[PDB]
Amino acid sequence: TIPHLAIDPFSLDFFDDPYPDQQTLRDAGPVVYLDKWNVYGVARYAEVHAVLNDPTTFCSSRGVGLSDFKKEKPWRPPSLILEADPPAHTRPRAVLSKVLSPATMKTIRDGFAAAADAKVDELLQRGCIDAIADLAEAYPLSVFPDAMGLKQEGREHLLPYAGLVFNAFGPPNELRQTAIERSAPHQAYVNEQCQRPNLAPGGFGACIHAFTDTGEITPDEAPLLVRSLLSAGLDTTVNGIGAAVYCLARFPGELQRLRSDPTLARNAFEEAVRFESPVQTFFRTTTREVELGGAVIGEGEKVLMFLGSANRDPRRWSDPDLYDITRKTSGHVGFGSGVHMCVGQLVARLEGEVMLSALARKVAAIDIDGPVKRRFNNTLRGLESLPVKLTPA
């Protein structure tokens, strides 16, 4: 009753061009079984959304990667928010929500916007740049470690640590195994910076520690919540902003619409999150036998959610394969959905908005002018190198 497929969604051939295999996965049925890894898959919007919004049946505390924490030891202590279920999830989630809140965004917006305009001005002076290293990586590196309150020394560990985190959600393939092999120095740097004395006053890290006296978290929880922001908060935005720039480089008509109304910058970024889905996949584990789209899934089974495929499901989206900066994107699952829906989405959107605003006001054209190289990661979709020529407006 459930179709069995041999597609490996963690293979380099799939990362290289996932869209045919995603259609195959959607059209095979609402629930597939992936024989390569012995997990269930859901690739349509309706089932991805249903799974995300039933945390009791499809839990996160057994790990949101392939590994089942009830069977194997996690490679690092579980995240107190991503890898927790209600009710343990609830109060740590409330603390990060207040740390990364609307009020916080007001304190950081002017500096994030200045840094974005400055970076685009700098890049227009060079003309031909790499939109990954010089822009999608450089701009978040110029604002986010400072917003965390991190010291200068050791920041080169941040992107390696995040690549490790996102590879470690995957199955035990060579991407995962090599990342873990190399991990010790990046873990040791990250874990150290999570301690209260190492986080500068006023930053997100110190704000987490400052919340340890309200009864929501205790002091011994705050290092791991800082770890969550140092895991999720940089590399995701690198690939979100890289997605948007790639979209604008491929779809010049849409750069032109964005130039003509820079207030489209925030929706242009949202649409790039839908269109590319920087965070491709997460897993759940079933806590009971459950009927999902006619298929009966047993207890204790891993379920792989294809967020990017749900975001390109023609059963939900008109012309899903078109980048449309005036699309009504509400409902996409590029940030998740439900109780774990990205708690950092206001930081993500603020960064993406102020960078696309800078491009809209300052850049007349973005032309690819070199070989495009794709970066392979078990969870993140994005580019290694994106050589572009920027023409000034």
Ligand code: HEM
């Ligand atoms: C374009 C940028 C980003 C994307 C695409 C993205 C994606 C996601 C997704 C898909 C989830 C849901 C996880 C799940 O359901 O299991 C999530 C959760 C989360 N994200 Fe984001 N993320 C981004 C940026 C950020 C930033 C900038 C931060 C921190 C500053 C952040 C911190 C978190 C945390 C802590 C969670 C866990 C929330 C919870 O479990 O309740 N993310 N993110």
Ligand SMILES: O=C(O)c1ccc(I)cc1
């Ligand atoms: O809690 C974490 O470490 C974590 C949370 C969200 C993402 I997306 C990645 C990592």
Ligand SMILES: [Cl-]
């Ligand atoms: Cl760690």
